[PDB]
Design a protein around this nucleic acid. Sequence first.
DNA 1: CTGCTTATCGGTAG
DNA 2: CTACCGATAAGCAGACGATCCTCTCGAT
RNA 3: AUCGAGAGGAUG
Lengths: 56, 49, 119, 196, 56, 98, 160, 30
Amino acid sequence: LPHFSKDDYSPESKGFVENSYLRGLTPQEFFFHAMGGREGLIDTAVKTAETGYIQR
Amino acid sequence: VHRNPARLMETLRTLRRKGDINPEVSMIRDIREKELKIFTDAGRVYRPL
Amino acid sequence: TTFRFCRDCNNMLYPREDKENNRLLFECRTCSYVEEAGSPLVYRHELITNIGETAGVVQDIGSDPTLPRSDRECPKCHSRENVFFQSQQRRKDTSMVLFFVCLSCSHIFTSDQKNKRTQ
Amino acid sequence: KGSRFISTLQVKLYGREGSSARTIKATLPYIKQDIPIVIIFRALGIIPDGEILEHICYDVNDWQMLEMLKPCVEDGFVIQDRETALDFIGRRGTALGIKKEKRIQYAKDILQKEFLPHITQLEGFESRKAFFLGYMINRLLLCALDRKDQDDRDHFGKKRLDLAGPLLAQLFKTLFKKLTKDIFRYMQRTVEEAHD
Amino acid sequence: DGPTMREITETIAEAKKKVLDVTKEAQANLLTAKHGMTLRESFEDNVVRFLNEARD
Amino acid sequence: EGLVEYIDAEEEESILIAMQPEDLEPAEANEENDLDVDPAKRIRVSHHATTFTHCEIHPSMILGVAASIIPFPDHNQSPRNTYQSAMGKQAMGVFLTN
Amino acid sequence: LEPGHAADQEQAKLIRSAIEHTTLKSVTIASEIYYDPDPRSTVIPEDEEIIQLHFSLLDEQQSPWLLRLELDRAAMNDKDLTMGQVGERIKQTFKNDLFVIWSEDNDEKLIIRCRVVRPKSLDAETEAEEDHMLKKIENTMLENITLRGVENIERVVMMK
Amino acid sequence: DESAPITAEDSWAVISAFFREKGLVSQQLD
DNA sequence: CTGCTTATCGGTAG
DNA sequence: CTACCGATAAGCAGACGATCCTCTCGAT
RNA sequence: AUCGAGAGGAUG
Ligand SMILES: [Zn+2]
Ligand SMILES: [Zn+2]
């Protein structure tokens, strides 16, 4: 994200959330977290169609 | 082509930051490629800031 | 490598052996023009490549904001001013080495502590 | 400001890593086959090799760049002149001999209209379209050598949004134009009569 | 627990700072590649674990 | 007056946006491990680059019209945030005065 | 492993580097062509003693166009190979129609040198070009040469 | 003192200013 | 993302 | 030294793409 | 009544 220098390979840069749900997420953290969850929906959305094509 | 976008850029951005050149128009200086695209297409998403 | 072009018609050159006297002669399939040879190197492939690594470096880079800035020292001028980055040779197997460009001298240097470098 | 003439162009590169000859061709709208870049340049109006390479590669040092272009050059020694550079561009049917000059006057304005309609679509521009077609090539290669990555497609700023305005346009244009030749079709039936 | 809390973050402290060290190895090319995998890869792996393993 | 510049996605490429106006360029203490801070406050990555061009308005502003309905969205596992977003739009209320 | 061995890891290595596919392409720094005419006195000065060895006449040409192959000191350590084994497999492929040389592992620059040989005597017609068939051999060389192991087999791992 | 920079709160006034102007469907209007 | 479609490599009779 | 009549590659595109429910809206 | 389009609900 543009709030980062280029070629930064450490945790904070590439999607590791230090803080716990209780302490709360930080601006970058949240987006990243968002970035993955988004994958969660993707599958249960149209990867089910295959799973159900199999059964049939 | 242009030669020496040291000032060309900074008198492109100074003009936009006065309202002269439309604040909606985007201006991309690329040091590492030696480029300068300029955009005025209808359908560009921007924000602040 | 380097190959060359002809004057007069300006096309590409295609090497030929000098039967009689044992040497090399470039020429174009346009007119007749023939120069002699430079270095005996005709073709080079390379599969592993050390250039493409440092690409883009200007006299305008020491202003680019989207690039880190660290506590190194110039082998030559000693100013702690610099920017750096990993090989812009975006191949799959490349090393993860840093490339420091001095501001106060525009001298270019590396992190690598083994391995020789000739820029 | 010119409707929606989506006329698409593609610069290809034949043979995968380690093939024999890596020949470079292109998709040209309204023609049947892919056509070697060198002939395309010639058909424009840059005739000599080694000036050809001056619209493409931009640093007469980086050689691997230059070396990659060899086989393209060696593809177009079969065509060397302004004139017949457009001859190859002729095969899209059979002129049957009837159109020998006129297939040029077909190939001539195909590189006025369909080939890169932006940059301009006017008559007297060729060195505008070459340097660019020479810029499509510097990118194509400047990837194959693996010096910069493949182009991302989910990048947001390189997509657009058809909001309500241009929507209406893409519609109104169409409808107005349809009304436009409704009048034409009513006129051919006037005089004929008067009328009024 | 307060003193427990300190300890958790103080165990994402050293389990992040172990990464800044392997990064600062690979960047000065000492990181030797595991037979079979790319350099960048052995690194990519080295870290992923170091972070998971910190979390657990 | 030159305080704000409408920034596009592409142009987003060449910039270095700060996150918090105040705590992204004051001075050094340094605060990373030094006595003392609030144990209960969260752990902010920090500012470590200092060559900025821009600065972010307020983070919260990455969110959308239904998303800003959530309270503490940054304490929920994402899908929860997204999940609600779909319901705020079948929830019942004052849909217009007229 | 063979039941006749169990936890001898030195055994497992033997198997690994007799299974793992290794193309010549995977150990080549830079494949280059040269015009070298005088086979006894090479124009390049990096090879001043190769080229000074080669003890022929024991026993007991020619070829105009060279072909060089620099090899990495690096991946010689990983996949286990003495320069010779390389050389012989190269020759084994073409047979008696290409000369072949190489430096020793001890040296600083590891290199190969080859020259096309040698169709004369009972002929037919069209005697020209040759430079095109030279490249198609440096091309066959990289992408059709095996060195050790079976094909279809990439990285091989020592899992316990 | 008019010299000193923005801080925490002050950021928000800038936001309100924005919506005061463009409202909310600005794009769809514009 | 299979089974059927359509063009080259070449080991033997002619 | 040639067609010969065979097999194999280099691919022709291919019919497919979860379940059951609730609303609203425009056209034959 | 019919065909075609969209929004949502459960597996999420
Ligand atoms: Zn010439
Ligand atoms: Zn210096």
